[PDB]
Every structure is written in structure tokens, then in C-alpha cells.
Write an enzyme that holds these catalytic residues in place. Structure first.
Site, mmCIF file in Angstrom:
data_model
loop_
_atom_site.group_PDB
_atom_site.id
_atom_site.type_symbol
_atom_site.label_atom_id
_atom_site.label_comp_id
_atom_site.label_asym_id
_atom_site.label_seq_id
_atom_site.Cartn_x
_atom_site.Cartn_y
_atom_site.Cartn_z
ATOM 1 N N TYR A 9 -24.388 77.744 -20.651
ATOM 2 C CA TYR A 9 -23.543 77.964 -19.469
ATOM 3 C C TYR A 9 -24.369 78.104 -18.203
ATOM 4 O O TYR A 9 -23.807 78.095 -17.124
ATOM 5 C CB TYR A 9 -22.691 79.229 -19.649
ATOM 6 C CG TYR A 9 -23.527 80.451 -19.908
ATOM 7 C CD1 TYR A 9 -24.084 81.176 -18.860
ATOM 8 C CD2 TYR A 9 -23.758 80.880 -21.213
ATOM 9 C CE1 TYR A 9 -24.884 82.259 -19.115
ATOM 10 C CE2 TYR A 9 -24.563 81.930 -21.470
ATOM 11 C CZ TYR A 9 -25.125 82.638 -20.399
ATOM 12 O OH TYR A 9 -25.918 83.743 -20.626
ATOM 13 N N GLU A 13 -35.403 82.618 -23.927
ATOM 14 C CA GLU A 13 -34.494 83.641 -23.474
ATOM 15 C C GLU A 13 -34.918 85.074 -23.780
ATOM 16 O O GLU A 13 -34.178 86.013 -23.480
ATOM 17 C CB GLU A 13 -33.102 83.384 -24.057
ATOM 18 C CG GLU A 13 -32.469 82.077 -23.593
ATOM 19 C CD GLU A 13 -32.084 82.097 -22.088
ATOM 20 O OE1 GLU A 13 -32.963 82.171 -21.211
ATOM 21 O OE2 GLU A 13 -30.906 82.129 -21.823
ATOM 22 N N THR A 55 -28.743 78.081 -16.652
ATOM 23 C CA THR A 55 -29.831 77.210 -16.128
ATOM 24 C C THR A 55 -30.209 76.106 -17.104
ATOM 25 O O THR A 55 -30.935 75.176 -16.743
ATOM 26 C CB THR A 55 -31.098 78.000 -15.762
ATOM 27 O OG1 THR A 55 -31.714 78.530 -16.943
ATOM 28 C CG2 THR A 55 -30.781 79.168 -14.898
ATOM 29 N N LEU A 56 -29.767 76.243 -18.351
ATOM 30 C CA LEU A 56 -30.000 75.226 -19.390
ATOM 31 C C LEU A 56 -29.099 73.998 -19.362
ATOM 32 O O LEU A 56 -29.421 72.995 -20.003
ATOM 33 C CB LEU A 56 -29.996 75.844 -20.797
ATOM 34 C CG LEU A 56 -31.104 76.862 -21.060
ATOM 35 C CD1 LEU A 56 -30.834 77.582 -22.381
ATOM 36 C CD2 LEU A 56 -32.457 76.241 -21.094
#
Length: 147
Positions: free
Chosen positions: A9, A84, A11-12
Site C-alpha cells: 500500500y 521493513e 512506498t513499495l
């Protein structure tokens, strides 16, 4: 080997600042499958000194959050856990995702990077339906080693 579905959802996502890490084959395999929204609502906030997006683990608060579904291999899954900084910064959580477009049926279970370790005052930040680093909130992502 088996694979795993994930839902990103932040920055990926395609077109977002950290998408490259999913395209770097030295991290494993990630195949785009489509677009979705969480079935449950969660707060999505842009918070902290890096303007990072965080999906707060408060089911039933905020909105259904939009994002992208990928099928990844185990190497990529473990890379993303490290990226993460799980389990301190985020915790990987399996959630039901309503399929909006598919390149599976109405929904798919996906791993999602949520957080229960947010700063408490982030509860008072705006709750987003979707994330764009270049959005009108004006809080562009900045990389972790910036001071």
C-alpha cells in the site's frame, strides 16, 4: 516451491519511491497480479521524520486501503521482512483483500506490513484511503539515513 501473496500500500507500490527493491532480482521474485483494497478498514497515516506510510493495526478504524497484489517467492518475502525491519517497525499480518483488478475470485488472502508499534500521537494524523508520496498532503518520502 510455493509462493505467497502480498499486498503493498505504501512506498513499495508501482510508481512509489521504494518500488525498485521489488524489481531487483537479487532479492528474489515478485510478480504483479493486480489491484485491491483491504476488506477490513485500517488507518493509513504518513508519519515520522521520513514521511513513511504506516497501516496501523486498528481494524475497523479509518478506511479500506487500496494497494497492489503481488505473488512473491520466499526469498523476496524474507527480504521484505528485513527491509521493513520486522517485527519491531512493522509486523507482517495476513489480511483479506478485495480484488479490484486482476491480471482468484472476489478476495485474496495476502500478507501486509501493518504496525502495532506506531507513535501514539499518529492516531491524530489524517487517515488515507491510498498512499502517494507526491500527493497533496505535501509529505514526500525521505530515505531512512537522512537526518
Amino acid at each position: 516451491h510455493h509462493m505467497a501473496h502480498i499486498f503493498v500500500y505504501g512506498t513499495l507500490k508501482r510508481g512509489q519511491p521504494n518500488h525498485k527493491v521489488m524489481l531487483d532480482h537479487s532479492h528474489g521474485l515478485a510478480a504483479f497480479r493486480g489491484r485491491g483494497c483491504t476488506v477490513e478498514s485500517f488507518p493509513l497515516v504518513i508519519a515520522g521524520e521520513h514521511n513513511i506510510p504506516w497501516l496501523l493495526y486498528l481494524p475497523g478504524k479509518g478506511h479500506c486501503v487500496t494497494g497492489e497484489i503481488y505473488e512473491v517467492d520466499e526469498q523476496m518475502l524474507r527480504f521484505l521482512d528485513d527491509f521493513e525491519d520486522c517485527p519491531s517497525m512493522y509486523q507482517r499480518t495476513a489480511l483479506q483483500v478485495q480484488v479490484l483488478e486482476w491480471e482468484p475470485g472476489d478476495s485474496v488472502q495476502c500478507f501486509v506490513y501493518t504496525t502495532a508499534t506506531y507513535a501514539p500521537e499518529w492516531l491524530f494524523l489524517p487517515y488515507h484511503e491510498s498512499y502517494d508520496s507526491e500527493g497533496p498532503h505535501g509529505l514526500r518520502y525521505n530515505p531512512r539515513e537522512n537526518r
